[PDB]
From Swiss-Prot, chain B:
This is NADH-ubiquinone oxidoreductase chain 1. The gene is MT-ND1. Core subunit of the mitochondrial membrane respiratory chain NADH dehydrogenase (Complex I) which catalyzes electron transfer from NADH through the respiratory chain, using ubiquinone as an electron acceptor. Essential for the catalytic activity and assembly of complex I. One of its GO terms (cellular component) is respiratory chain complex I. Disulfide bonds: none annotated. It comes from Sus scrofa. The keyword Membrane applies.
């Protein structure tokens, strides 16, 4: 006596279902990456230049200590 | 007292390898939307012990066609060399202080490949032979580029002494001066430890088990321990070479902690890389190393020879 009941889609329809490819760009330019790399290299070069010059001075100092102690 | 130090080196390395197996399983599980071992002990902390006990209580078998002496010798050589690779590493003091530590590690690494070659040949099986020939190809691919990269990086150090790398990086990491060489060295160490995407010798999808297919039980376990110890050692060496931790002579534990975190991060980076990528073809690996890595390596070797002279920054200690 009751209404026919069955598994049916809701009145209207269903919400849209996405299927298309979605790969966002999500990246920097090539120039920016290359510039960051070159700047990092230059900073490291300058720091290591100072450090190695100081190390050469220290090495000369201890070599002179040896020279003084040798006789 | 020196044997005490040898043991205090080797035994914790074996424990670290045992738990690195579990760390790998859990990390690759979580990157794959699962958990990994969490039943055998809390959070799977007892899994490596169960694995070792199962492996060393299982029957080892001699193949009928195998050459017995080389078959037994190869895992012994592998494990002994893996343990030996750790003695010159300064953490911050090395067990063995060498004038030439880097080149010693190079020679021992070159010798380590013969364990794979001899196991594959002495197994007297087709898949093991294919694995051994792939190992020959891999070494031919990576050896020269790796050595020249070491040369170029160490040109700024002034010697081949591993402990000098701490002094060289007192103010800045070496990576900030040689990051292209750092990337190429990282890929070369990935290839050198037979790790994905360069895990050609085992070749599980293609060769079933490759060079170690015949091996079972305890001998198989030693090959596994040797490989994982080599992974940890290579990551520690990379950390020393490119990420210099500040060392206080009156407090070396700070350097030890900093070193351990950096090498753990590099090992986890290997694990991530394995979880992320497919496998190379073993001719493509040689083409990559000989057509892309080798030219840049030669050019950067020239550049790193010229740079200290141009900027008057030659390091001391001839
Ligand atoms: C002076 C004399 C020189 C002494 C040699 C040293 C001792 C090796 C002799 C014992 C091995 C042979 C036993 C055997 O045949 O089956 C065993 C036995 C019989 O099996 P079977 O099925 O009944 O019969 C098999 C067939 O008879 C045949 O089966 P097969 O196909 O296996 O036969 C081949 C085997 C048969 O051997 C022979 O033909 C005669 C032995 C003479 C070999 C000497 C040649 C020179 C090689 C170079 C010099 C090496 C150093 C020697 C100097 C000593 C001072 C250190 O030859 C070998 O493979 C031995 C090679 C030894 C070199 C190992 C060095 C490792 C190199 C690591 C890198 C090096 C870094 C730089 C340094 O099976 C077992 O008991 C299980 C395996 C036991 C083997 C243990 C490991 C091998 C010995 C260790 C080598 C020493 C390292 C230090
Ligand atoms: C995609 O599937 C796969 C995985 O994913 C699930 C893996 O993990 C995987 C790697 C293999 C795992 C199953 C790890 C296996 C664990 C080892 C074989 C156990 C080794 C542990 C011992 C041998 C080390 C020694 C034990 C001691 C406690 C160390 C101390 C030594 C004393 C002297 C002190 C493979 C190959 C795989 O194919
Ligand atoms: C415990 C009693 C010890 C007896 C030792 C006998 C060794 C032996 O040859 O026996 C073979 C034995 C067991 O086989 P089965 O007899 O079939 O089964 C036994 C159970 N019933 O096989 C083995 O375990 C051989 C183990 C190798 C012995 C160790 C010596 C090898 C030395 C290697 C040197 C190479 C070094 C390379 C690296 C160094 C380079 C810097
Ligand atoms: C195996 C390959 C052997 C290579 C061993 C290299 C070890 C090493 O480099 O240590 C160097 C160290 C110190 O050198 P420096 O850097 O100048 O510092 C100290 C000076 N103040 O030199 C040493 O201690 C020499 C010790 C003796 C050399 C060891 C020889 C090993 C040869 C292996 C033979 C194997 C056993 C015999 C049979 C083999 C096969 C059965």
């Amino acid at each position: 006596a009751s209404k026919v009941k069955q598994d049916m889609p809701p009145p209207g329809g269903y919400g849209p279902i996405d299927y298309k490819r979605n790969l966002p760009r999500r990246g920097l330019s090539g120039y920016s990456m290359f510039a960051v790399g070159i700047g990092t290299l230059l900073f490291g070069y300058w720091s290591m230049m100072k450090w190695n010059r100081e190390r050469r001075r220290l090495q000369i100092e201890d070599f002179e200590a040896r020279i003084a102690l040798m006789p | 007292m020196f044997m005490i130090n040898i043991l205090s080196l080797i035994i914790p390395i074996l424990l670290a390898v045992a738990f690195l197996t579990l760390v790998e399983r859990k990390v690759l599980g979580y990157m794959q939307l699962r958990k990994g071992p969490n039943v055998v002990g809390p959070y799977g902390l007892l899994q490596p012990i169960a694995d070792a006990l199962k492996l060393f209580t299982k029957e080892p078998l001699r193949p009928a066609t195998s050459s017995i002496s080389m078959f037994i010798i190869a895992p012994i050589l592998a494990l002994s060399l893996a343990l030996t690779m750790w003695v010159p590493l300064p953490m911050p003091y090395p067990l063995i202080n060498m004038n030439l530590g880097v080149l010693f590690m190079l020679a021992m690494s070159s010798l380590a490949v013969y364990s794979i070659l001899w196991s594959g040949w002495a197994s007297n099986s087709k898949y093991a032979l294919i694995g051994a020939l792939r190992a020959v190809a891999q070494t031919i691919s990576y050896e020269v580029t790796l050595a020249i990269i070491l040369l170029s990086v160490l040109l700024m150090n002034g010697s081949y002494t591993l402990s000098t790398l701490i002094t060289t990086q007192e103010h800045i990491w070496m990576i900030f001066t040689s990051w292209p060489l750092a990337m190429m060295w990282f890929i070369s160490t990935l290839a050198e430890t037979n790790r994905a995407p360069f895990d050609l010798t085992e070749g599980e999808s293609e060769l079933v088990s490759g060079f170690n297919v015949e091996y079972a039980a305890g001998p198989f376990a030693m090959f596994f321990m040797a490989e994982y110890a080599n992974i940890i050692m290579m990551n520690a060496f990379t950390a020393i070479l490119f990420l210099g931790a500040s060392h206080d002579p009156h407090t070396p534990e700070l350097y030890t902690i900093n070193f351990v975190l950096k090498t753990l991060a590099l090992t986890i980076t290997f694990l991530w890389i394995r979880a992320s990528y497919p496998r190379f073809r073993y001719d493509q690996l040689m083409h990559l190393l000989w057509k892309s890595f080798l030219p840049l390596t030669l050019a950067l070797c020239m550049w790193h020879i010229s740079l200290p002279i141009m900027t008057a920054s030659i390091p001391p200690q001839s």
